[PDB]
Amino acid sequence: PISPIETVPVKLKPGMDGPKVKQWPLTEEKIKALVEICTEMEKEGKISKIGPENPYNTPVFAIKSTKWRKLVDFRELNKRTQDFWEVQLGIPHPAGLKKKKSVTVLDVGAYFSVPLDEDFRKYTAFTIPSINNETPGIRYQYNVLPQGWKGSPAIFQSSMTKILEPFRKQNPDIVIYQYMDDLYVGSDLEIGQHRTKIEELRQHLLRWGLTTPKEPPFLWMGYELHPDKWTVQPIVLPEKDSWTVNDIQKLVGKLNWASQIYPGIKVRQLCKLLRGTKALTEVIPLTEEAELELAENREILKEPVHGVYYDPSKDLIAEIQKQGQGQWTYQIYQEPFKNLKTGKYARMRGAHTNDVKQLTEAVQKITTESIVIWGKTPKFKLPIQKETWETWWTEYWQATWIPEWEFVNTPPLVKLWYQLEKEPIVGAETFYVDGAANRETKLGKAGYVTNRGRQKVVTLTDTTNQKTELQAIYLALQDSGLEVNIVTDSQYALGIIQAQPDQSESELVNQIIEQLIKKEKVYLAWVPAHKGIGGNEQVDKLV
Amino acid sequence: ETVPVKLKPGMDGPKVKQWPLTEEKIKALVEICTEMEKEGKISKIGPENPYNTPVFAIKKTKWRKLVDFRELNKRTQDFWEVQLGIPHPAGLKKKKSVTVLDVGDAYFSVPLDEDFRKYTAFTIPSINNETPGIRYQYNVLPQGWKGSPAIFQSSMTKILEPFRKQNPDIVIYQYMDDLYVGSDLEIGQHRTKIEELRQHLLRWGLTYELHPDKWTVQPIVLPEKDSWTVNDIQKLVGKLNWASQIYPGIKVRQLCKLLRGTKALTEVIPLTEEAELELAENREILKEPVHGVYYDPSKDLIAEIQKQGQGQWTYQIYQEPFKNLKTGKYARTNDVKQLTEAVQKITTESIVIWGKTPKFKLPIQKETWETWWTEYWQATWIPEWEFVNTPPLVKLWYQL
Ligand SMILES: Cc1cc(/C=C/C#N)cc(C)c1-n1c(=O)[nH]c2cnc(Nc3ccc(C#N)cc3)nc21
């Protein structure tokens, strides 16, 4: 059947005409196979035959079991067709679904049941070539949505939506969703009243030209849906003697997928082996870290876990734990500790951060995810003291705001590991530091002069102004005592250090962080260079 | 009859992602939009429309719909600026009182050129993507599109013609969905005149007090001290030297050379001769506007904002960096709420002064801003913005 639904008007892209691709000649088997296929399709109204008035054409092929398959190659038409609104903007996450008592599944096996805009059919013309390509072939055009055309998924789903809308209002308490060839229909009715309303829906579908002749758990989109719970469909981790790039990529994807419900999954050490572009077939020995990470993941996965569904009447609670080395993990529940969802956050935003910036970025990522899945932000439980957090964000120059949260004593706690002094330290030495690199030679010098008369200059190869300016500050911190004042000319290095990083991609910056933690007091100040400013011009001379 | 509207040559309609909405804002948009549809102001559309601009709900106690036409505005900027431009009166910034009136309901009476309507498409998302977003396009002039006041200009002139003729000293300026009405009247007579104007607008289906006269510059301030340490003078030299890049005349050497040798920061330093005096020139230099900086109408305005802490924020507006057209501060329960308020205040002032909104350089993570700004936004326009990492001492140099 061809649905009586009204058609969607369609246009070619502005300034373009429909395709005129030439049909390659085919084997007699393939011509025979296609005349048969097209004669059934013509009986059912899916296609019509047309004269030679129509100048448009799209190649057609046939490939074989003992089935024969028609293959209309819509590449040229597709790149001349307008764009459509896209079908799905996102996939529903299971953790956002509500508990259902009954879930039915009707067969709804598609495109050839939805009509195609009359003004557009001519551009779908195709030609069954005659034998050894001597007479003009038989010419058809589509009357329905052709398989493989750009507009079909969008126009089908829009048609399927208008058809359902009547039923969706007379039953605003029933959820209907479209998965492949099955329609999933869910209600909080018992099997009696449920499959009565299933019947009227199928009656309603039949009136629109749609034929309908599964038990939980439903396997869908990688998930396993049960009536009262959900999980990811089973993850089995291979037991290979030897690992290829290809095996580690597939394993990282599976662990990443499992992290949605299995808490604490780690992939950092396994991902680190994939750095440095190498062949998919090449074998990578596992470092001992990656083997401890693989070992830990296997224990996490030994017994199965499940997620619960969403109760709209209760709050969401989000908990975050620090797993170390930029790795964060989180759980969302409504009753402790029955998880709707878990996840991980392990992004380096910035070359240098601290745990407070990383925890706020993680809260931001969880907040957005909550809006999408549940339409509502959760209450946070975070491993950071209220005092730490408002010490940091008030003094810091970016704005922030995280929603309602509460401290939770789950170590490691987030804390600032050092504090720069607010004003210069009486009785402590003052270092005037400076770095410099020659842009040609990549050669540089770093050093200091102190108010107590000391001075040092080291030399540096394969270096930049940026690294010599940080080298100078590191020098000052090694040679000084527990308290020190440091005058630099580098806004670059002051910027970094005033942000109180506790981690960095630069081993230099990490060495400085090592030093700043041992110190009892450090005042850091900036002066413009090349203004003859006391010690700064004098240390500038040396470098 | 409808005014034909055209995009820029070889420009396509906007395809902007909808940001996720909370259940409460989705539900508000749904009711607003069903009522507009039954009144015919918008219509459901099918998948053959691939365009999108984002939509939000904001508050004045009752929800209001805000469509982000920023992208469309850029792609129709020949229509509303060079073809049907609304001229900006230099008189407005000189008035003692300026009242802002929303006149956006005017546009719901004018039909929109049917060949343009598809470009106004927008989506109401659904929670958890369980259902296809509800999709709509405009049939009338939409609020927030800079094409609307340009097309309505003809009619606005006919509405205001009696009131302008009877009050020749009042300046009325339209910007997007607002009227700016400025007078030198005493505040009571000014309010009375706003009331009469409301009555003129009410006979055609059209239903907050600024004092531009008192928008004083925020000069760069230099400390006045009893004693000066090494540290104090270094901070002073750094602050003067950065200031010298905006204010020609700023000099630092006399101050510089009492800092010679490598002395401790804590060492007290008595000022020298022209040293103490140059703090007088430099002070005298910095408390008056920049010579030779002028607004170029063909260039974009930029606004930079620094967080100073303790509920205070500084800002500068410029077109080419260091040549500030304006500098200010914003005074005084959330970092994002405060910043959202400063952005709205800076945009309003700059509508009044130049008839243009600035592009904002905002000191905040993008996702934090996009997740929270609508909880506090009250204007009907949206300026362009981008996210930046404030240089460390630019904040120290604009500190009070
Ligand atoms: C997004 C979705 C996907 C599928 C795919 C199925 C496949 N394959 C099926 C349905 C009905 C829905 N669906 C929708 O569109 N709105 C819903 C509200 N609440 C639930 N909850 C729910 C769903 C299934 C079970 C089970 N077993 C238990 C609870 N689903 C909803």
Author numbering:
A (entry chain A): 1 to 64, 68 to 112, 114 to 217, 223 to 552
B (entry chain B): 6 to 65, 69 to 215, 232 to 356, 362 to 429
Copy the relevant paper text.
Reverse transcriptase (RT) of human immunodeficiency virus (HIV) is essential for viral replication due to its responsibility for the conversion of viral RNA genome into DNA. Thus, RT represents an important and established target among anti-HIV-1 therapies to treat acquired immune deficiency syndrome. RT contains two distinct druggable sites: the polymerase catalytic site that is available for nucleoside reverse transcriptase inhibitors (NRTIs) and their acyclic nucleoside phosphonate analogues (ANPs), and the allosteric binding site available for non-NRTIs (NNRTIs). NNRTIs target an allosteric binding pocket which is situated about 10 Å from the polymerase catalytic site. HIV-1 RT was co-crystallized with cyanovinyl compounds 2, 4, and 6 to determine the effect of the size of ring B on binding in the NNRTI pocket.
All three compounds maintain a hydrogen bond between the aniline nitrogen and the K101 backbone carbonyl. The potential for a second hydrogen bond between the pyrimidine core nitrogen and the K101 backbone nitrogen varies between structures. This distance is longest with the five-membered ring at 3.4 Å, suggesting that it likely does not contribute significantly to binding affinity. Due to an opening and solvent-accessible area around the core, there is water observed interacting with ring B in the five- and six-membered structures of compounds 2 and 4, but not with the seven-membered ring B of compound 6. The co-crystal structure with compound 2 shows the most dramatic change in protein conformation. Notably, the side chain of Y188 rotates away from Y181 and sits more parallel to the cyanovinyl. To allow this shift, sheets β9 and β10 move, resulting in the Cα atom of D185 moving 4.7 Å compared to the RPV bound structure. Because of this, several amino acid residues become disordered at the periphery of the pocket, markedly from residues 217 to 222. These protein movements are possibly due to the position of the carbonyl in ring B and/or the wider distance between the arms in the horseshoe shape. Most importantly, compound 2 exhibited significantly improved phosphate-buffered saline solubility (10.4 μM) compared to ETV and RPV (≪1 μM).
